Amino acid sequence: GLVPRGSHMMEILRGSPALSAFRINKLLARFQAANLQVHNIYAEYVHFADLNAPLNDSEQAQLTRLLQYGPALSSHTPAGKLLLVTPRPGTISPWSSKATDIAHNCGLQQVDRLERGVAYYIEASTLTAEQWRQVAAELHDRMMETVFSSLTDAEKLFIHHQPAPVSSVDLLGEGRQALIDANLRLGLALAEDEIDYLQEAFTKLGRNPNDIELYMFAQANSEHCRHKIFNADWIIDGKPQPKSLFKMIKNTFETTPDYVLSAYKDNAAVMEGSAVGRYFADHNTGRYDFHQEPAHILMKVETHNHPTAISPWPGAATGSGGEIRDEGATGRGAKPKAGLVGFSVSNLRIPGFEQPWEEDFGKPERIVTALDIMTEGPLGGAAFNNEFGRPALTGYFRTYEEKVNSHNGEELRGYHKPIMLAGGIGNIRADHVQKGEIVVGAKLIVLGGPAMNIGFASVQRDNPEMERRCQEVIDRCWQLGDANPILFIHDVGAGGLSNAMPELVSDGGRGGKFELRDILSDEPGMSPLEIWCNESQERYVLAVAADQLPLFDELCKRERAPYAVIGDATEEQHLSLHDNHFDNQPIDLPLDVLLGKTPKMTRDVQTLKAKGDALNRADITIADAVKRVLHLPTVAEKTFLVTIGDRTVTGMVARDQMVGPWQVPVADCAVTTASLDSYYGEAMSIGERAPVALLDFAASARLAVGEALTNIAATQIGDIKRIKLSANWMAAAGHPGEDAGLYDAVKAVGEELCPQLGLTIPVGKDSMSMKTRWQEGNEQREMTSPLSLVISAFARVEDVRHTLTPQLSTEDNALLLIDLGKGHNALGATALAQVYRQLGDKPADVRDVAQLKGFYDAMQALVAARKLLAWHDRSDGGLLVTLAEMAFAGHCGVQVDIAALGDDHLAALFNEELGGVIQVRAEDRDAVEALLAQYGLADCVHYLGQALAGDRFVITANDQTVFSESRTTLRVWWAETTWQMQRLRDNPQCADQEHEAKANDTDPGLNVKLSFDINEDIAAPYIATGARPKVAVLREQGVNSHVEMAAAFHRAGFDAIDVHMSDLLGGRIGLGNFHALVACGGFSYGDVLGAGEGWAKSILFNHRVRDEFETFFHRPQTLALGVCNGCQMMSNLRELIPGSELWPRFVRNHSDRFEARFSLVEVTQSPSLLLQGMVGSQMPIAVSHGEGRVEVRDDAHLAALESKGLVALRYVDNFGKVTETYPANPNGSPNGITAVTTENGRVTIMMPHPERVFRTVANSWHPENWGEDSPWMRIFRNARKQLG
């Protein structure tokens, strides 16, 4: 299929069927519902290659082959009306970026660009032209895609427009009116004083401004970029105030500077970490080693609220993507470690599952629903974290939408504009914490992706693999230590380059001169304004000395990170942009003019305070309340948000959300090890309580801080002054009451509580227009957010191993409540009130700052001394939920008495005051109570009773039974929300299976059987000789699990060498010098054209590297391992490997969802040399994949594979049987297959990651008796011994 396209040819190639049966049934169903009478629906990927030159037979076959991928779904002969869905013309999909990379790396330079569409074939035959538009509408996303009638209509996707010229705004010719006209025409959003400043500046300069200069200025003076509210002067109830919001936040550093290395000066904050073994490959040798040095800790938290409202997937993806850039661009280069994720939305209103507090209040047409946000956003955030390679380990998710009598009377409050929140921690070297000086003549570089027309203007675009490559360069740069060439670095975000690059020279006291046509652009029609000010993703800006440029270029080429030198730093503090194409100068400005400031804002405002009403209990019974609270999404099980995101990459994850044998997602905070050779680490927690702010601003803010503290407290940290906070403020500024509440709330934490507790807030952010207006009848409606403080806490951890969870034990035990509420038992703005459509009266609050600190200190004392069996704090859903979730995590019963807690049982069970339940050994109860009394806690400590074996959740009040149910019943109710979300988002069959397994109380949870001694280092005689065989640790662009793979081979006595595919293509390395090869995990080319395919095919279609791999595998004494992406790649090179004739392929999981699980496997009999001695063993292992379903050609292949004895690992359920039920088997592989070997055992591929869990501390659940090494260490030691 080959056609003309301007001065290019366009090829059209068939692809594979695009829809699984269940996806088809969903479409047919939606069609029946909208009363469209569609008889049948079929879809098929189709691919469009824009060629700059012709392809020969050989190359034509190669391209065709590249585009045969995916599940082998049942194919069909097209019938009915064709509707072709493609990206919007003038847009380039991420798929296209990555697939085009692969063509290039397979030596197909003739391919200018590849793009994909989906051809739908609809048989209805009944429909009107209007109804076909309704069909067309179901089949695509209005914001990213369009629908065409013809395969040849795709030629619009590749039109090249002539570069548009710069456009001047005629101030000198029209006066002020021209600036007014441009302010509306270009949507610049300028204030009148901003327009005056510009009129004057350009009038002084004596010439007309260019559109680009105005646009740059407007986006730098947005509330988003300038933060005027946060620096404003205040008058509140007629009294001027001495400090701005920012000043009140800095107060916390002024009063608590301890441990902080950088604050308010950079893209992230930095605090002291620990001296540990930092593991990476030297520039010199390419050998990986430990570098004993300080690994200091950075932190940042960002939001992406507006874009998530319009296009939730890319909005959430880029929210995280931008924040990862911030982290990497801290100092002179740093390394992201773990992530966090947050969502706030209006009511879900799940079809079929509507809850008694949900009311449809309508919404704007321009925005998506709450349910669409929670279906697509989390997938997008996960897309970035998974494809980039950072584990997501903590998060919140709240739903709120209600008509409530709050500070400005009866109003709608909620999150029609949602919160989407992404943050993380990273590590940084001491000597890179400070930004270097920008030397005059410094080259100014853009690192990363090409410019496209992105910042419809709120629909973002993510390419995480691009950012990954960029990060490898940054890692190459900090790993050079004091030879790091990065003088200064900054992320590119709002305002794109028009903000980032003046920001950069300015921070350095320099100017720059720039050349527009040096910037990498994929859209040649862009105006200069568009090149300079677009908000395209995956870009950094930096300065490097001219003489380091040859180093920076070797680094980038080898990682295949694109970059451009676009200008020079000048002594003179001027900004210039030249254009070689139009031989002119779009920007010619002094910086003090460009960055000059209009007067600061003054806000002169007044307090509103809701009275709010006492809770009406007419319809409330304790039993009906328990059922309702557990069906509040805020309370309810969060699995749909957790298993979609990787939790194990880096091999440093110690505590993830999943807890215990039953992997229940209730961990109160995240923890990571500092290195792969220490038990020191880092921790993260979140606290958050917005609804309280509808009654009381300050209390909500204090509660957010306190809850972060209670969520982190059972971690071994020590001094509270180690705990550092991000404060992210969401508000409806201007909405009556909100501004005074904002001031009061910032003061409450900045001026008071945080200083009193010794808590620093060294980073933060604000998002100041959390409101939505639209027309419903011909009446206007507003949905206004509560003031929403989200606190994230971060800390150096002293000992990762001493972390407690909510997992109860049934040994002889005592359950003690710490009620920091002190009997107040407030019910206002609780889960309980919400769920009976009320706000209620008095909310919770920090009641006693000294006791709050006493609590933290006591907990630390008990954690260090090992005096606790379990911990869970009280938050949403109260003590009731706290106890229920512990019982869930411990798979046991609870027997408690709440008589000492008041006569008001409702209020005792459902208040959301601070505190928690501790479990201790019965024999320690007195000593623990005595210690808590020593820190002043006596009167709020209450003995409750005990955890017991069994399924009874029982609550008494001396002789009366308050509440009594099956723990399992409660646990299933608590799961219904995630079940319903999984059911409508994923393969329903899988969601139901997962849900239904939870109802079987007999589930023994994860358990282990070992055929060998986990502590016996069978490699030690060999290590002891000092002879260290090399292992080729092989990575392709996009690979992300290589450091921990290398660390595992290293512990077994290997010299791990960093072999990038570019090293093999450039002849710098040759497999002929190795006896051992490992292909690592990740998302090479973002899995595009099928996970592992581009990697493998770039090997195959380069005949010289192809031969290198064939020769290796054909030698008699070589060994190879392929894990995950590497398992996939190797399965796609089968032709090079002897004894692999029967091997399967690996394709989309049956669930149709990325599965990040801790899965139980067994070791099966096979020739596998790496699995020697382990056969019969049953242990859990890290699973992180979207495309691991084993697929065979037919039953004959499967039988043949099986009878040859090549299957090496299988998934089993917790009862220990081979299973295809989900998630025990996360991907749907036949016979539970997840590893296979060759006839001679010398090559083995597996989908799970043993390299992520070779340390016991990096197993989510593990038996108490295991030492440093897990069972999976034996794989690597088997390799060592086998080489001999």
Ligand SMILES: Nc1ncnc2c1ncn2[C@@H]1O[C@H](COP(=O)(O)OP(=O)(O)O)[C@@H](O)[C@H]1O
């Ligand atoms: N949006 C999210 N993404 C990832 N994990 C989340 C998210 N929301 C909640 N979680 C995780 O689910 C578990 C339960 O969350 P939640 O009940 O909100 O925690 P808590 O009540 O302790 O503040 C926690 O381990 C939390 O980190």
Ligand SMILES: [Mg+2]
């Ligand atoms: Mg100190």
Ligand SMILES: [Mg+2]
């Ligand atoms: Mg909770």
Ligand SMILES: [Mg+2]
């Ligand atoms: Mg908690």
Ligand SMILES: [Mg+2]
């Ligand atoms: Mg919380």
Ligand SMILES: [Mn+2]
């Ligand atoms: Mn009191």
Ligand SMILES: [Xe]
């Ligand atoms: Xe300007």
Ligand SMILES: [Xe]
């Ligand atoms: Xe962490």
Ligand SMILES: [Xe]
């Ligand atoms: Xe104790």
Ligand SMILES: [Xe]
């Ligand atoms: Xe290996």
